[PDB]
């Protein structure tokens, strides 16, 4: 077993992330901010501390301690000014550490604990010129953590002891996931420290751990939290395990030392040997040790003496690296043990040991050459003779508390055996405000313009399953994560889905009809989606069993040619193949988490909207669509005509009592009848000078000449059993709603082949009684263009399938529609779109708003 | 299994110990102190706050928060004055809790953790008008396990117990101590109850009642000492209760606001604790609710209790109580106060009353629920045999701790072999004030009844108390007699005195004419080391002699005939050699290191035999041969003349000779009967004190050459050896060398030359300055020895002076007691009984030194 480190965050000196931290440690950067004398004559400090010989002007400062996004957590901007900036920075650090874990901990299945610590609440100093809250319960309140919210308060091992207490809670099953760390923060964010002679703080301004030039430490400020989980749960959940805490030990010195402010060799050696015994390991197996590494005159050889005593059982020489983050960022007081554990878990995961700064020679009392240790001066790759990068993190408090954590490597997860990544992926990005979404999209732009960048099934699944969906949201469908970075860099000029999400307790489903049918209709969605394949197989199995005409052969495997693209044009396989395609798209969207409030049809989409309402079943609908298709194939040939005029004007200028074929919009109408009475008469529109397009049709649907087509099948309707509707259809051949007897009567479908469709009158009615978006189900963008030409106020229509000639873009168009619908606010289950066996990765976290929440000094 | 609560301590309102708090709960006393205007103004609360009308003069008060025994902990007066009083009170409480556990935490086998909490530092406002608490305690108590300052809000103490149980169950420590503390500068303060506050406007926590108006803010300290239950049964600790299960969680945001509580979270904690406890809600017959008595808190706590207890089909089987009715809201110690009450209730079998409860709350319906609230203190006999309980503590930030708290498993009380007839009761303190008041506390303790087993009180006072400088010890056989003895400690007749180091101890092996019948008979049957040494001596003497040593002492009847029949010379020298060898092998079995070791005419043989010059077997082959030859020498006498030896030289003739120069006022003259009778008749008209020595053979006289002549035929080339231990010989009067003790004619000239015991004592006194311990059946070499120039040094007898022959077990234990009091390294754990167990006794009585910055 062991406790996996599945997520980490923190603000550090000259860093804001545990990746800017790691980029500073791989750069061997000194993150100590050296101030000028002129700077501190702005920040309320006395004019005598400046121009003093005992005063150093250095600290490791975190960046923005006054800034807080209170509106993210619901904190009013008057409770926020009465918060410790440690509370605020650890709120944002805990949200970031859970996002780095790939989780929202408010709705994690199991039980989630916070175990953190805090330095001196020196914000209370000016809050006075009387009390305050507990940090760990502010985190557990504002993030809905329902496990133990225990503040631990040892001195400078607070964060590693917090991690150890968290690991005990995980291993006694007090919680199922835990977040542990600490924070050192304070109003004098720009200050020196008066390094006194014989004092424990460095007069150099530089923490030189284990060096002969060691003057002390330099005080750093910082936050940091690690998200912890047991290793079998973290392995079965596919988490990003940085390192596995295999063993831990806390003890105290306890007056077996000279004074109270003394360190004890035997106590620290007890901690190191106890942690390595619980880790199931030996001192031979540890190849990096993050020491507490304070740089002090007196505690530097005590820690090395304890390390040598604990590692004395291994008779190998200089095999284990020894480091200290305090050379880079400074003594992080309380947060020192989580800065070291964050660095060491990063080093165990990555496999590179960063440099330990300011080292040329050992201490006088510390010999490295006969010891098992060396100190890296430059960044160093970490490949051990063992094969496993076991490590050790030591933190030591001023009152004698000694924590030691052993970090073995994460186990080998076997991902080349995984099934391949799907061809496209929605990348969903959501934020509580628009500024946070712009900055978060910038963060992933910077993240995705790196050469090291995750899987598209590992990403997108962390972006959906591991972030909470907020209102201001955006999405991208991509097949390449580099192009995703290129699109995100373009600064709100790119054509991805974007906009604030409303509730949308409803989506309308415009089941289209005969119009834009094509060659590879639904072939891409057949292979990738099992729901689409199972529904279209449900259609095709019945159709192959009953009728001689072949389905899954015309659409899929037959060649791309006019000889097949006009073999699909004839009515006997235009109707049932389009029914099967619209039915299978419908079952696909219903498997994606779509509730059709209103379903309308267009001369065939009623037949399939009917069987999503289940007024008569799928097999009976396939029979009564195929008989319907065949029985109008031997009807005499007719033509239609797109007369773009209002239907009152068309019926006021009608040549003879034929029937209108379609009433689609008040700039759009279809007239049909006998073929000669359509074309030979359509030359009077040339005298009108109004364009009259054609529908490329060899038959006259919805005209007054296919009465006999329905007269034969009038008997065929009355032997099958019909049902009342379940979902709210509105009928397009009445222009109004659907009652119980509206669909059940078989003569309604008989007159449905004769009467014009009032698609406009079923569209203004639909937007009146349902302020909804209109996802079009069908072969192309037929009904979507007419619906977006309609008078929809702040409402759009979307198409499931591309416009026919782009028949290879099905898997991109339907996923782009899913992206625009999810952005719009619909309840699309975006976890269906990710991959086969997905894993969580470390992505950029929420880009909180820097809002000044400071009182006065 | 679970985590045993093996000891506890605390200062509570109107209590200074856990026992003074349990008496308050069994007496159903409201421990809230109500002030006046003059008292609260004299403390210094500003008159605007007191002439506020909505201001309540009530508080639970610990008494002595300015008083610290710094010098017990090695703390300077300034370093103590700059401590938080919560640090100071919780140090004394931690020392007291380990004492109540029966341990010194510095000297425990495994490693020991502190997990405690603390309120806000209100004394830092006195400091301004760091030093974390667990590491301060871990320093001054030498704790070498995790020192973690657990800090939730009002759940702290119980959460700290939960974290301690985590550390114990995962084997991070072997025994832990956990609890917390609220107290601070405004010892006398009121709290300004407002409109709809969480604080009671009348000054009483009437928890779970109609008349509820909040809590009253108390102050207190408390720590329980925790240990895994298999170890705690193994080590004989007294277990109050076992912690079978525990649970901490938080509300989350699943409530109206941050100050709101939540039924679902507290029910989750209660059911999780009872699930990890391996129990069901039917088994839990007491519940210590959090019970603050506030308007939004009682119905939520009861709704959570009902929801977690909802699986039980019985009605009003479980008692429900809070301690805040008695003591108030202790705000950080709340939770260890309830756990202390509940662990006491679980161990004793008595549920204390909940105060001020007449009618249930309007939102609380007791009658259909599983809970009744006790108005009077009742016993606790569940329908099962075993008393399970539950302790709930709730923080102000959402944290909910619940602890399920089972009865300790029953030991077999009659199965132990019985208590030894006498016990040493060792008391020790760093100060004479602390030892005086700690003797007073055991006087009031032993003036109870149903007292602990005296083996167990002795065992806890020896192993379980640190041996300090100012000491006292009592050898008793009734604990009530011991309490009446300790009540008169000014006129005290027991061992008492400040202990110097006493690296050295002298061993005055006794003479020959100072024995009594049935000597060693107590120690033979009580002690195994005496029986082993005496049995090897006696099996040698019965292996080749007509005598039988075990018959003449332990079997044959007490009579005046045998009272001199063991006192002939033939069966007195080996008899006394065996008694003194067994007595010395008993004393060295008790941690005695002999530094010097000097004979008196026969004890020099056993001085050599303990040194290593002789094997025991070869020495006792020939001690009785020397006895045979002295009894074969015909006749003699000894008269004691109380005159210096140079003045003895005036009136001593050629045949009679000096035998023993024991003191400058004590001289023994040996010779024929009729001649010393004439010399005594010459001493008749001198009016000088003179008696006979009741023996018929004149040793170290002129009749001993024929008796010493056969010993030269003896010694049979025995495997002799130069000495190990420093013998100062009584024939030379000074130290003895490697060859000057081991020549076979040295014992011949020891049989003849006068004993220079007053010179051997004075040389030992000069060169070593040690307390002396007589080994032998009387005090004859004791008043001689401390009638000398002993500079603050005493001699001690290991056996009583003859007529007190039944008092051997009392006398030798009183000598052990006086030796331990003076400072000698007696181990007092060979004197406790067979299978001794730790018990709860009064703890250290820290003297009240007032340290205060303001």
């Amino acid at each position: 077993f062991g406790i996996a480190i599945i997520g980490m965050a923190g603000r550090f000196p000259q860093a804001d992330t545990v990746q800017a931290f790691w980029e500073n440690l791989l750069a061997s950067r000194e993150c100590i901010s050296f101030y000028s004398d002129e700077e501190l004559l702005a920040m309320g400090i006395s004019p005598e501390f400046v121009q003093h010989p005992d005063y150093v002007k250095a600290k490791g400062e975190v960046a923005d301690i006054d800034k807080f996004d209170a509106a993210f957590f619901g904190i009013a901007p008057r409770e926020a000014e009465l918060m410790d900036p440690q509370h605020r920075v650890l709120l944002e650090t805990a949200w970031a550490a859970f996002e780095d874990a790939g989780y929202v901990a408010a709705d994690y299945p199991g039980d989630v604990g916070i175990f953190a610590g805090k330095s001196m609440d020196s914000y209370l100093m000016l809050n006075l010129m009387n009390d305050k809250d507990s940090i760990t319960t502010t985190i557990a309140y504002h993030l809905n953590l329902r496990g133990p919210a225990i503040t631990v308060q040892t001195s400078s091992s607070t964060s590693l002891v917090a991690v150890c207490v968290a690991c005990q809670s995980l291993l006694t099953w007090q919680c199922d996931m835990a977040i542990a760390g600490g924070v050192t923060l304070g109003p004098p964010a720009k200050t020196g420290y008066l390094s006194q002679e014989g004092g424990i703080t460095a007069a150099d301004g530089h923490c030189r751990a284990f060096s002969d030039n060691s003057s002390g430490f330099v005080p750093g400020t910082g936050a940091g939290l690690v998200v912890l989980k047991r290793v079998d749960e973290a392995l079965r959940d596919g988490d990003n395990i940085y390192a596995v805490i295999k063993g831990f030990a806390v003890n105290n010195d306890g007056s077996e030392k000279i004074s109270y402010t003394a360190p004890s060799v035997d106590a620290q050696a007890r901690a190191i040997a106890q942690a390595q015994r619980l880790a199931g390991l030996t001192p031979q197996d540890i190849t990096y040790v993050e020491a507490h590494g304070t740089g002090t005159r007196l505690g530097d050889p005590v820690e090395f003496s304890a390390l040598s005593q604990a590692f004395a059982g291994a008779s190998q020489k200089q095999y284990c690296a020894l480091g200290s983050v305090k050379t880079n960022i400074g003594h992080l007081d309380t947060a020192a043990g989580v800065a070291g554990l964050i660095k060491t878990a990063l080093a165990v995961q990555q496999g590179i040991i960063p440099a330990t700064l300011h080292f040329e020679r050992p201490n006088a009392q510390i010999d490295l050459t006969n010891s098992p240790f060396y100190i890296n001066t430059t960044c160093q790759p970490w490949q051990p003779e063992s094969g496993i990068r076991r490590a050790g993190v030591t933190s030591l408090g001023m009152g004698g508390t000694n924590a030691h954590v052993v970090l073995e490597q994460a186990p080998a997860v076997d991902l080349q055996a995984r099934a391949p990544v799907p061809a496209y992926s929605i990348l969903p990005f959501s934020a509580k405000t628009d500024s946070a979404l712009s900055s978060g999209l910038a963060r992933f732009a910077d993240f995705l313009q790196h050469e090291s960048l995750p899987d598209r099934r590992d990403l997108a699944w962390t972006l959906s399953q591991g972030r909470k969906a907020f209102a201001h949201r955006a999405a991208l469908v991509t097949r390449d994560l580099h192009a995703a970075g290129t699109l995100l860099q373009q600064a709100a000029t790119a054509p991805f889905a974007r906009g604030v999400a409303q509730t949308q307790l409803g989506l309308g489903l415009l089941f289209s009809g005969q119009g834009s049918q094509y060659q590879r209709m639904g072939h891409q969605l057949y292979q990738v989606w099992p729901a689409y394949a199972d529904a279209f197989d449900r259609c095709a199995t019945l159709l192959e069993r009953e009728y001689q005409l072949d389905i899954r052969h015309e659409l899929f495997r037959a060649e791309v040619s006019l000889a097949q693209g006009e073999r699909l044009a004839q009515t006997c396989l235009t109707q049932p193949l389009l029914f099967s395609v619209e039915y299978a798209l419908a079952q696909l969207w219903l498997s994606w988490g779509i509730t059709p409030t209103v379903m309308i049809g267009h001369s065939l989409g009623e037949w399939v909207a009917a069987t999503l309402a289940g007024v008569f079943s799928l097999e009976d609908a396939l029979r009564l669509v195929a008989r319907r298709a065949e029985l109008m194939h031997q009807a005499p040939s007719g033509a239609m005509l797109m007369v773009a005029l209002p239907e009152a004007q068309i019926r006021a200028l009608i040549t003879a009592p034929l029937a209108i074929a379609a009433v689609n919009a008040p700039d759009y109408s279809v007239i049909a009848g006998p073929t000669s009475e359509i074309l030979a008469v359509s030359q009077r529109l040339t005298e009108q000078n109004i364009i009259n397009k054609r529908l490329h049709t060899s038959h006259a649907f919805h005209s007054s000449m296919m009465q006999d087509a329905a007269q034969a099948l009038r008997q065929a309707f009355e032997n099958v059993r019909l049902n009342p509707p379940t979902l709210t259809i509105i009928s397009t051949v009445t222009g109004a709603h659907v009652s119980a007897d509206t669909l059940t009567t078989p003569d309604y479908w008989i007159e449905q082949m004769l009467m014009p469709v009032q698609f406009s009158a079923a569209l203004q009615e639909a937007q009146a009684t349902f302020d909804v978006d209109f996802l079009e189900i069908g072969p192309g963008a037929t009904l979507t263009q007419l619906t977006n030409g309609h008078a929809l106020g702040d409402r759009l229509a979307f198409s499931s399938l591309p416009a026919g000639a782009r028949s290879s873009d099905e898997h991109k168009h339907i996923l782009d529609t899913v992206a625009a619908l999810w952005v719009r606010g619909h309840n699309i289950d975006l976890s269906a779109f990710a991959g086969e066996q997905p894993r969580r990765v470390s992505l950029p976290t929420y880009a909180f708003d820097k809002i000044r929440y400071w009182v006065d000094s």
Side-chain angles (χ1 to χ4, degrees), chain A residues 36-253:
Chain A
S36 303
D37 44 355
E38 58 86 20
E39 262 157 28
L40 281 79
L41 315 172
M43 293 297 177
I45 192 166
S46 298
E48 52 90 14
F49 274 104
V50 57
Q51 302 88 3
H52 207 269
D54 216 21
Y55 204 50
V56 182
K57 285 157 183 164
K59 98 187 283 188
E61 59 174 359
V62 293
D64 300 315
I65 75 156
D66 43 355
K67 308 303 186 301
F68 183 43
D69 199 13
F72 183 86
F73 301 99
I75 298 146
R78 276 70 174 175
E79 318 178 350
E81 303 203 332
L82 277 296
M83 293 177 71
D84 202 5
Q86 323 189 72
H87 289 213
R88 317 195 217 143
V89 166
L90 211 69
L91 264 173
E92 298 170 328
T93 302
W95 188 257
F98 278 125
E99 275 174 324
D100 205 65
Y103 281 102
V104 182
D107 48 355
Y108 180 79
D111 190 359
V112 174
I114 188 66
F115 304 88
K118 185 167 78 95
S119 72
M120 182 179 72
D121 193 349
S122 65
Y123 189 68
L124 221 20
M125 288 344 144
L126 13 124
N127 254 3
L128 261 51
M129 283 73 74
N130 290 108
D131 290 308
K132 220 178 283 188
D133 205 349
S134 173
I135 183 154
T136 301
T137 64
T138 63
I139 311 307
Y141 179 57
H142 285 304
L143 301 182
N144 196 1
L145 319 173
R146 291 169 313 270
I150 301 172
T151 289
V152 310
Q153 278 300 92
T154 75
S155 183
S156 293
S157 66
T158 301
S159 296
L160 203 62
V161 162
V163 168
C164 291
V165 163
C167 292
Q168 299 208 82
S169 283
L170 278 149
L171 292 160
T172 62
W173 298 60
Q174 279 276 287
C175 47
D176 278 28
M177 182 178 72
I179 176 165
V183 48
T184 309
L185 238 91
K190 267 188 54 189
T191 181
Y193 52 99
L194 203 76
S195 174
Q196 65 183 357
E197 314 297 318
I200 68 172
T201 77
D204 208 0
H206 311 71
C207 182
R208 320 164 156 274
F210 313 103
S211 194
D212 59 13
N213 220 330
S214 305
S215 313
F217 59 80
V218 64
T221 54
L225 287 149
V226 302
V227 173
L228 304 152
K229 202 196 272 183
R230 308 188 269 275
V231 74
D232 53 342
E233 299 176 349
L235 274 187
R236 68 159 168 82
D237 294 7
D239 292 331
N240 47 343
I241 306 181
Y242 289 84
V244 187
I245 309 191
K246 278 293 267 188
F248 50 90
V250 186
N251 45 53
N252 202 257
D253 290 358

Side-chain angles (χ1 to χ4, degrees), chain A residues 363-383:
Chain A
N363 204 298
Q365 317 166 58
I366 290 170
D367 70 319
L368 277 297
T369 317
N370 295 283
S371 84
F373 311 124
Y374 54 95
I375 319 291
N376 299 305
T377 44
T378 60
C379 204
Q380 189 257 326
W382 185 2
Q383 69 276 17

Side-chain angles (χ1 to χ4, degrees), chain A residues 175-418:
Chain A
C175 47
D176 278 28
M177 182 178 72
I179 176 165
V183 48
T184 309
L185 238 91
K190 267 188 54 189
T191 181
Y193 52 99
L194 203 76
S195 174
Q196 65 183 357
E197 314 297 318
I200 68 172
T201 77
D204 208 0
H206 311 71
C207 182
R208 320 164 156 274
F210 313 103
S211 194
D212 59 13
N213 220 330
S214 305
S215 313
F217 59 80
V218 64
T221 54
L225 287 149
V226 302
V227 173
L228 304 152
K229 202 196 272 183
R230 308 188 269 275
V231 74
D232 53 342
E233 299 176 349
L235 274 187
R236 68 159 168 82
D237 294 7
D239 292 331
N240 47 343
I241 306 181
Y242 289 84
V244 187
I245 309 191
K246 278 293 267 188
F248 50 90
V250 186
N251 45 53
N252 202 257
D253 290 358
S255 88
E256 294 294 328
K257 43 174 185 176
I258 302 299
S259 158
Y260 177 68
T261 66
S264 162
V265 169
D266 291 330
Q268 307 181 26
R270 261 192 309 125
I272 300 158
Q274 187 196 341
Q276 290 171 13
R277 187 204 327 129
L278 298 180
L281 293 175
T282 61
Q284 188 53 56
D285 284 344
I286 306 295
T287 301
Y288 175 63
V289 166
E290 165 73 28
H292 189 58
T294 306
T296 54
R297 188 270 299 164
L298 188 153
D300 266 350
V302 173
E303 188 156 15
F304 198 86
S305 297
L307 268 167
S308 300
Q309 182 196 325
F311 276 78
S315 286
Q316 208 153 35
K317 188 261 301 175
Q318 279 215 341
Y319 68 99
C320 167
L322 178 70
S324 169
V325 196
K326 321 208 159 60
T327 63
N328 300 96
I329 60 171
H331 179 42
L332 270 224
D333 195 45
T334 50
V338 75
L341 176 85
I342 275 166
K343 186 178 78 67
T344 311
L346 278 172
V348 164
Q349 171 211 51
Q350 293 283 275
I352 190 167
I353 300 164
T356 314
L357 306 199
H358 323 302
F359 188 80
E360 277 215 20
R361 283 90 64 192
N363 204 298
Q365 317 166 58
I366 290 170
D367 70 319
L368 277 297
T369 317
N370 295 283
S371 84
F373 311 124
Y374 54 95
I375 319 291
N376 299 305
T377 44
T378 60
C379 204
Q380 189 257 326
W382 185 2
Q383 69 276 17
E385 176 92 348
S386 165
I388 298 101
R389 311 188 280 270
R390 307 154 169 123
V393 180
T394 305
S395 197
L396 312 167
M398 294 299 291
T401 313
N402 322 299
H404 188 83
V405 163
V406 171
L407 296 173
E408 168 146 2
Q409 205 188 11
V413 290
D414 202 1
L415 296 191
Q416 78 263 20
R418 273 207 304 199

Side-chain angles (χ1 to χ4, degrees), chain A residues 421-432:
Chain A
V421 176
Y424 288 88
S425 281
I426 300 96
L427 316 193
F429 302 103
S430 58
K432 281 210 176 201

